[PDB]
């Protein structure tokens, strides 16, 4: 087949070592390793076959190497194909499929990455203009579908809720030992699952949660992490502010039961909130307290902690093998995205020519894809509005700065079990310390 000259239609320039390179050791379609942006756009809108995986990876990651306005200009340019009888075949097997691929890209862009348009109204103006100029009978159905999407974008049986000492409605008595431990774990799992599910790839690609505009670009991610940090600190606080030893043993024991239920729910964020609290300086040194923890709960906590050993070897295997719903620990994804982006070149060079390194972007898109896969399935659990609100509004730090607060926790640790004879402290809980355990009531 014969195409226009590159001096009229830039996407006609043949492939070469200086244009496109492929992955050499890996659904019938070759894996692009690197290429100029012209070639990447060509293959993104290739006439010989659709390439949904390339489209998804591209639209998830292109902003590191191409700005949204530039991409719109480039796919418009691709669409406007000039002709060089044998034209009938050219129109059938080149113009038509390339233009359909362009509309497919527009459709996926507006559908899954509409945030580009919400942040640049002029981008949306250009897109609606472009779509409006599209006059074709083969195109009409795709054009109408795109317009519809754009218009829309401008706009089983759960178990019984468990109760312990606090009764329904008695918000004022809600606390670590008065709410039922199963229900604490369930409502924290609902909170943390929603927090996990709200995080979008746009907060992650580009490592933007580490940069000076993180608060603007990664608000859901930060809110999620901040909740996790808050719960860890609240667990440590509950422990070291319980100065009576017997009561402290009951507190630590209840927290291990909450951990057990987190494990039952595959809430690994919850597992690690607890594990991080137990590893904290103020808590880890409380030998007189762990002394009285029953050996079964010691084993529960031991298994959970071992999930984090060896750079999370066992956490990773267990996550690979569980079935949803679950709440992954996000920290590992963040490290892998950041180290992938920082540990690989943006550009490869071949024959003095610069080519966008696309494989590093594919690696980042695989990570964000795995996150999304665990955001699909929700938990079959009922919300308890008041328990939910209680955990949303936990604020163990109060007005203190981080250093002041963690120093105060460590000094409480030193006071309740000195480095010095062990003092006695009076009880603070009026109610019974015995746990209802972690099996339901029916």
């Amino acid at each position: 087949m014969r195409l226009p000259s590159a001096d009229v239609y830039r996407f006609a320039e043949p492939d070469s070592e200086e244009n496109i390179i492929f992955e050499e050791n890996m659904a019938g379609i070759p894996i692009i390793k690197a290429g100029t942006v012209i070639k990447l756009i060509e293959r993104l809108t290739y006439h010989m076959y659709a390439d949904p995986n390339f489209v998804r990876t591209f639209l998830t990651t292109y902003r590191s190497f191409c700005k949204p306005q530039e991409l719109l200009s480039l796919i418009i340019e691709r669409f406007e194909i000039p002709e060089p009888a044998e034209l009938k075949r050219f129109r059938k097997e080149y113009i038509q499929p390339v233009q359909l691929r362009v509309l497919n890209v527009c459709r996926h862009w507006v559908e899954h990455h509409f945030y580009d348009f919400e942040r640049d109204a002029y981008l949306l103006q250009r897109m609606e203009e472009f779509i409006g100029t599209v006059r074709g009978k083969a195109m009409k159905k795709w054009v109408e579908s795109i317009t519809k999407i754009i218009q829309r974008k401008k706009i089983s049986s759960p178990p019984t809720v468990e109760w312990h000492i606090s009764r329904p409605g008695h918000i004022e008595t809600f606390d670590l030992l008065t709410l039922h431990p199963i229900e604490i774990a369930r409502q924290l799992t609902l909170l943390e699952s929603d927090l996990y599910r709200a995080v979008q790839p746009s907060e992650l690609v580009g490592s933007v949660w580490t940069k000076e505009d993180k608060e603007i670009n990664s608000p859901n991610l930060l809110k999620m992490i901040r909740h996790t940090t808050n719960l860890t600190l609240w667990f440590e606080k509950c422990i070291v502010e319980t100065e009576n030893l017997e009561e402290r043993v009951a507190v630590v024991s209840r927290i291990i039961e909450i951990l057990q239920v987190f494990q039952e729910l595959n809430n690994f964020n919850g597992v690690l909130e607890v594990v991080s609290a137990m590893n904290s300086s103020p808590v880890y040194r409380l030998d007189h307290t762990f002394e009285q923890i029953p050996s079964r709960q010691k084993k529960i906590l031991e298994e959970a902690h071992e999930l984090s050993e060896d750079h999370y070897k066992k956490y990773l295997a267990k996550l690979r093998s569980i079935n949803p719903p679950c709440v992954p620990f996000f920290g590992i994804y963040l490290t892998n995205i950041l180290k992938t982006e920082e540990g690989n070149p943006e550009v490869l060079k071949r024959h003095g020519k610069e080519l966008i390194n696309f494989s590093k972007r594919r690696k980042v898109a695989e990570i964000t894809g795995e996150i999304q896969q665990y955001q699909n399935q929700p938990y079959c659990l009922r919300v308890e509005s008041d328990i939910k609100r209680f955990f949303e509004n936990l604020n163990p730090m109060g007005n203190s700065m981080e250093k002041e607060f963690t120093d105060y926790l460590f000094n409480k640790s030193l006071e309740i079990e000195p480095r010095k004879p062990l003092p006695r402290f009076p009880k603070k809980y009026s109610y019974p310390l015995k746990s209802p355990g972690v099996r339901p009531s029916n």
């Binding site: 137990m278 880890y284 030998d287 762990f290 002394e291 923890i293 050996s295 010691k298 031991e302 902690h305």
Partner: peptide
């Protein structure tokens, strides 16, 4: 020995 939640010796 090890962590306070490990088996003593």
């Amino acid at each position: 020995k090890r962590h306070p939640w490990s088996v003593a010796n």
